[PDB]
């Protein structure tokens, strides 16, 4: 069960890698409608403090979650900055979220009567009074409960079905950066010309088994001419010599 609309669940992911191919795998082929960065470069362009949310809304608001457009969920429940970096991910959830008997666990705020600044959560459970009459009570006229429920009956069509959206976002404020995803480990090649790449080292040469003895911490190796000549294999920790061809 994801969090409802009134309280969008926060989750600050950090100190890990980047992997989003499984996101393509979750649902049949669709479009991300990604705003910040082009979808093909989310695996790369790694940042710090990836900022994730989780809440469930209707189908119409999926296209209405865009920054700049207002409404009820986008205005009174969750708003994005105009310089919002990052983008939303949406998929249909008829088979999980929708209930044949009628699931009413998901509720949204329709009455707040105040513009929301970007990126904050408001929990006004108390009832509101309108009409210049002090209500201060329970179940009275002009005393409206600001929290009302979605209806997720499975007989409805596209546009009213539950959609689970995970709005990722990224911020960059100095910092050493902690979130980045590597990939494409390839086979090692011996006694052949190679365009090698070890731990961010770019060069050309022929790799052979070596004899020098490193230290537990030292990785690279440099010669008199101040060039890389010995490199330690990142995966299996032996030492390979580099020779010109």
């Amino acid at each position, epitope marked *: 069960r994801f969090a409802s609309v009134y309280a969008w669940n926060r989750k600050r992911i950090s100190n890990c890698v980047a992997d989003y191919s499984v996101l393509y795998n979750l649902a049949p082929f669709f479009t991300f409608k990604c705003y910040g960065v082009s979808p093909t470069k989310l695996n790369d362009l790694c940042f710090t403090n990836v900022y994730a949310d989780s809440f469930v809304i209707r189908g119409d608001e999926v296209r209405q979650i865009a920054p700049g457009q*207002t409404g009820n969920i986008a205005d009174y429940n969750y708003k994005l900055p105009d310089d919002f970096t990052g983008c939303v991910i949406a998929w249909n959830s008829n088979k999980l979220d929708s209930k044949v008997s009628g699931n009413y666990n998901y509720l949204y705020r329709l009455f707040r*009567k105040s513009n929301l600044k970007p990126f904050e959560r408001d929990i006004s459970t108390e009832i509101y009074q*309108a009409g210049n009459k002090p209500c201060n009570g329970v179940a009275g006229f002009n005393c409206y409960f600001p929290l009302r429920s979605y209806s997720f009956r499975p007989t409805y069509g596209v546009g009213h079905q539950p959609y689970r959206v995970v709005v990722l976002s990224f911020e960059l404020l100095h910092a050493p950066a902690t979130v980045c995803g590597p990939k494409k480990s390839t086979n090692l090649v011996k006694n052949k010309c190679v365009n090698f790449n070890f731990n961010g080292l770019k060069g050309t040469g022929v790799l052979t088994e070596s004899n020098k003895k490193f230290l537990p911490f030292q990785q690279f190796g440099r010669d008199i001419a101040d060039t890389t000549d010995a490199v330690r294999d990142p995966q299996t920790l032996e030492i390979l010599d580099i020779t010109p061809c």
Partner: antibody
Amino acid sequence: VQLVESGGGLVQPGGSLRLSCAASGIIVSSNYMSWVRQGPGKGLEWVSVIYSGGSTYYADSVKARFTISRDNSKNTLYLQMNSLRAEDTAVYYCAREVVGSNSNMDVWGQGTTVTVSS
Amino acid sequence: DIQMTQSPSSLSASVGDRVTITCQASQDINIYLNWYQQKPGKAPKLLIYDASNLETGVPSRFSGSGSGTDFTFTINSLQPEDIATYYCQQYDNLPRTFGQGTKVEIK
């Protein structure tokens, strides 16, 4: 909780007047106001709506021509037109949106049959 | 925009009998749909809320039901004070659209 009409008179095309509709104690800024259009011999047409957050949604037929605002303390909604093309010989019904999700609140308001002619 | 249509324009033949007034929408819409009742020359009034509720003060015989781009309602008893027009209106899907108009008259 009743609604107070405010409007009248005859105007020429290209001119606009000060449409106002007052409330009897219902908040106009922290609420959901809306005006609609009713013609002699034709059906209703939605004109405009303003939310409590300041979001103005109005029909594309009058794009960039209507300006609407809720008074801070006078409990009266205001609107002004731009560049009348003389098809809005109408009566303008002022109100608030009938129901958010589920409520018994259904009050309406009277409107003045304004006419635009050379 | 949703093309808002209703075929039975004028049910003036019914005098305290079965009434089959109904409305249709182009796109598929849920119960977020209601109607207004308007006497000629004054502001409309509400009878049904969210296509499943009823007005605070009205005869209890009013019962409407509809889903899947089809909304139906019946008024089997034609009291003399209901001689006016009925309008269909879908909302919550901008732009908010209104029906062309339905006529009912007693003989």
